[PDB]
Write an enzyme that holds these catalytic residues in place. Structure first.
Site, PDB file in Angstrom:
ATOM      1  N   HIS A  41       0.801  -1.220   0.000  1.00 42.90           N
ATOM      2  CA  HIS A  41       0.000   0.000   0.000  1.00 42.90           C
ATOM      3  C   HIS A  41       0.845   1.286   0.000  1.00 42.90           C
ATOM      4  O   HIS A  41       0.265   2.368  -0.090  1.00 42.90           O
ATOM      5  CB  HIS A  41      -1.067   0.014   1.116  1.00 42.90           C
ATOM      6  CG  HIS A  41      -0.549   0.148   2.523  1.00 42.90           C
ATOM      7  ND1 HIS A  41       0.005   1.326   2.987  1.00 42.90           N
ATOM      8  CD2 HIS A  41      -0.625  -0.720   3.554  1.00 42.90           C
ATOM      9  CE1 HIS A  41       0.287   1.128   4.266  1.00 42.90           C
ATOM     10  NE2 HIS A  41      -0.066  -0.089   4.652  1.00 42.90           N
ATOM     11  N   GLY A 143       2.324   6.272  10.111  1.00 44.38           N
ATOM     12  CA  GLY A 143       3.739   6.211   9.769  1.00 44.38           C
ATOM     13  C   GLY A 143       4.418   4.937  10.249  1.00 44.38           C
ATOM     14  O   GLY A 143       5.578   4.698   9.914  1.00 44.38           O
ATOM     15  N   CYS A 145       3.516   1.823   9.503  1.00 43.45           N
ATOM     16  CA  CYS A 145       3.436   0.701   8.565  1.00 43.45           C
ATOM     17  C   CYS A 145       4.796   0.241   8.106  1.00 43.45           C
ATOM     18  O   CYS A 145       5.716   1.056   7.966  1.00 43.45           O
ATOM     19  CB  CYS A 145       2.521   1.022   7.404  1.00 43.45           C
ATOM     20  SG  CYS A 145       0.841   1.401   7.920  1.00 43.45           S
TER      21      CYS A 145
HETATM   22  N1  LIG Z   1      -1.766   4.133   6.286  1.00 43.68           N
HETATM   23  C1  LIG Z   1      -2.521   2.939   5.911  1.00 43.68           C
HETATM   24  C2  LIG Z   1      -3.864   2.742   6.664  1.00 43.68           C
HETATM   25  C3  LIG Z   1      -3.684   2.372   8.155  1.00 43.68           C
HETATM   26  O1  LIG Z   1      -4.514   1.684   8.733  1.00 43.68           O
HETATM   27  N2  LIG Z   1      -2.529   2.677   8.757  1.00 43.68           N
HETATM   28  C4  LIG Z   1      -2.110   2.853  10.082  1.00 43.68           C
HETATM   29  C5  LIG Z   1      -1.380   1.835  10.692  1.00 43.68           C
HETATM   30  N3  LIG Z   1      -1.246   1.661  12.013  1.00 43.68           N
HETATM   31  C6  LIG Z   1      -1.796   2.564  12.808  1.00 43.68           C
HETATM   32  C7  LIG Z   1      -2.519   3.690  12.348  1.00 43.68           C
HETATM   33  C8  LIG Z   1      -2.982   4.715  13.212  1.00 43.68           C
HETATM   34  C9  LIG Z   1      -3.585   5.831  12.705  1.00 43.68           C
HETATM   35  C10 LIG Z   1      -3.768   5.976  11.335  1.00 43.68           C
HETATM   36  C11 LIG Z   1      -3.355   5.005  10.468  1.00 43.68           C
HETATM   37  C12 LIG Z   1      -2.706   3.830  10.941  1.00 43.68           C
HETATM   38  C13 LIG Z   1      -4.700   4.040   6.570  1.00 43.68           C
HETATM   39  C14 LIG Z   1      -6.172   3.780   6.807  1.00 43.68           C
HETATM   40  O2  LIG Z   1      -6.727   2.808   5.889  1.00 43.68           O
HETATM   41  C15 LIG Z   1      -5.946   1.716   5.588  1.00 43.68           C
HETATM   42  C16 LIG Z   1      -6.603   0.679   4.944  1.00 43.68           C
HETATM   43  C17 LIG Z   1      -5.943  -0.518   4.732  1.00 43.68           C
HETATM   44  C18 LIG Z   1      -4.628  -0.642   5.131  1.00 43.68           C
HETATM   45 CL1  LIG Z   1      -3.767  -2.113   4.779  1.00 43.68          CL
HETATM   46  C19 LIG Z   1      -3.959   0.385   5.766  1.00 43.68           C
HETATM   47  C20 LIG Z   1      -4.615   1.592   6.004  1.00 43.68           C
END
Ligand SMILES: NC[C@@]1(C(=O)Nc2cncc3ccccc23)CCOc2ccc(Cl)cc21
Ligand SMILES: NC[C@@]1(C(=O)Nc2cncc3ccccc23)CCOc2ccc(Cl)cc21
Ligand SMILES: [Cl-]
Lengths: 305, 301
Positions: A41, A143, A145
């Site tokens: 992603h 951030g 990921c």
């Molecule tokens: N950046 C990718 C994102 C995410 O979840 N990232 C994050 C990962 N871990 C903590 C998070 C804390 C607050 C904000 C985002 C977080 C954004 C939202 O929708 C999605 C949808 C699918 C996937 Cl595979 C990733 C994501």
């Protein structure tokens, strides 16, 4: 003496963390040999996440569209391919700090250390368990990921998790290092939820053995139980079934403390039906389930890496 | 989201851990630049531990009586000296993995990561706090002496603790990296006991703010309190007094959540009176006191 939630020393993994940027998106990558692994992603904008076609988004990228930074050095991306939900960026330099490693897929109940990173820089290390519902109760901000989970078995780092997403309840989902998700999750911004979770019974028993080794015995009792009667109780309390494999794995702890596994099950049954009655075990008022039998033996024997 | 007990990544400290041997005694040392720091009790036998005269025991040692092993390489000891309860061994090689570092003496309530080691090899990393009674509730077995506690805010490692001893209650005592003990402890096997321990109030309040930041508000109430009334109640549950310094330190968390510090104090008073009634706060059924206000800000959104 003492019993702490302990992570593996993270140094071997810290020397592999890099920053991966694709357009406006920046996340972490794992640099092993001449390949940088990161969530696929990284190529998506927020709108692409609504319904991404990763093959189509990737074909539009050149090697120069991926900026990989290792410390203050920019690595040269010379190839890019996808394996499941992980993007693999071939680089022109093998990581000189690549430890002995393997990629392992873990099962629910297994624990691992997470090295939380931001902008390719390690920020903290904590110990997690893969929940029975395939989520991890991590601590991750935007951030994070591409941050990875791992264990060390002798001098070999076994990478078992790469962080991809946060679910609405604040728990986390990710993949193994081959890009296969743990759990029924997809890397798309669509309605997804963690299923009802259960307690990792074998780990609670291991932690009760850790408490006994540390001198906490108040919960011990004269009783024993059958494995079938214990599982009937455990099912009632949203605990995972205890198998004969679990009983066998707890053998060494049972021999060391003099408390048979089914004798400890009778303690756990009483704790489930009656609570702790104002008491604590290892400084906790809840039954801890994020220490495996191996973690308990390792911590109580001082195994080094 | 999420809130975990989090340690600093230990790599910078792992590259400093060495094994120090003097006669039959082996423990861990910290190799920074051309000096290896370790507990001075490495020069004692078990029989020397009741009333050791460290100056007298040390004068009898030469440089070649100290064997320092870094990985599979024996370092050459070219000098030795004692500073308080720490022995400093000058070696002929500067540690190429020496990070940017400093030595800091911490106060009770401060948290730090511990890299537990045996035979100069890291075994695990965990998060600790210096208790109000100057002990730490660590996880240390025989051979863990010389393991260190540290923080890494930016890329500078601040070493704050070196492990020396386990007290009869299973709690631990040690020194800063200048060899000064935390608390009234001494490096002797004479009868020593930890004083009655208390809860680190400012840290419990910081953790309640972490719970509010993460979306939980069930424990909040419509009340406030004076600082003095809060302390009169707090002391009855063996909580440390909350000072105006603590109130000031909680200012940023208070401004971020919109909950005044004395308003959060009223929530804490009510939690102490009522318990959790089957509820949890950040996955815990007890009030957590090993997160400082600084830890909460660093970890939380
Ligand atoms: N950046 C990718 C994102 C995410 O979840 N990232 C994050 C990962 N871990 C903590 C998070 C804390 C607050 C904000 C985002 C977080 C954004 C939202 O929708 C999605 C949808 C699918 C996937 Cl595979 C990733 C994501
Ligand atoms: N080896 C030094 C020793 C010790 O406490 N070591 C240990 C340190 N930490 C965890 C321990 C777990 C079990 C066994 C010993 C432990 C021995 C006992 O008397 C003393 C007395 C004073 C000092 Cl400064 C050290 C010590
Ligand atoms: Cl401090």
């Amino acid at each position: 003496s003492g019993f702490r939630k302990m992570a593996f020393p993270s140094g071997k993994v810290e020397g592999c963390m890099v920053q991966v940027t694709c357009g406006t998106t920046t996340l972490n990558g794992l640099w092993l040999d001449d390949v940088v692994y990161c969530p696929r992603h990284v190529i998506c904008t927020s709108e692409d996440m609504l319904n991404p076609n990763y093959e189509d988004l990737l074909i539009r990228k050149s090697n120069h569209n991926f900026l990989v930074q290792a410390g203050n050095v920019q690595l040269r991306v010379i190839g890019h391919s996808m394996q499941n939900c992980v993007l693999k960026l071939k680089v022109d330099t093998a990581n000189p700090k690549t430890p002995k490693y393997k990629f392992v897929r873990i099962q629910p109940g297994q624990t691992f250390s997470v090295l939380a990173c931001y902008n390719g820089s390690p920020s903290g290390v904590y110990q997690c368990a893969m929940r029975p519902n395939f989520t991890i109760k991590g601590s991750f901000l935007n951030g994070s990921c591409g941050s990875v989970g791992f264990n060390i078995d002798y001098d070999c780092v076994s990478f078992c998790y790469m962080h991809h997403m946060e679910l609405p309840t604040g728990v986390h989902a990710g993949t193994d290092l081959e890009g296969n998700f743990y759990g029924p999750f997809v890397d798309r911004q669509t309605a997804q939820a963690a299923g009802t979770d259960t307690t990792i019974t074998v780990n609670v028993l291991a932690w009760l053995y850790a408490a006994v080794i540390n001198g906490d015995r108040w919960f011990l009792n004269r009783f024993t139980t059958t494995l079938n009667d214990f599982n009937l109780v455990a099912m009632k309390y949203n605990y995972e079934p205890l198998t004969q494999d679990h009983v066998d794995i707890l053998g060494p702890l049972s021999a060391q403390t003099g408390i048979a596994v089914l004798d400890m099950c009778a303690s756990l049954k009483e704790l489930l039906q009656n609570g702790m009655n104002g008491r604590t075990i290892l400084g906790s008022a809840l039954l801890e389930d994020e220490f495996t039998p191996f973690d308990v033996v390792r911590q109580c024997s001082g195994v080094t890496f």
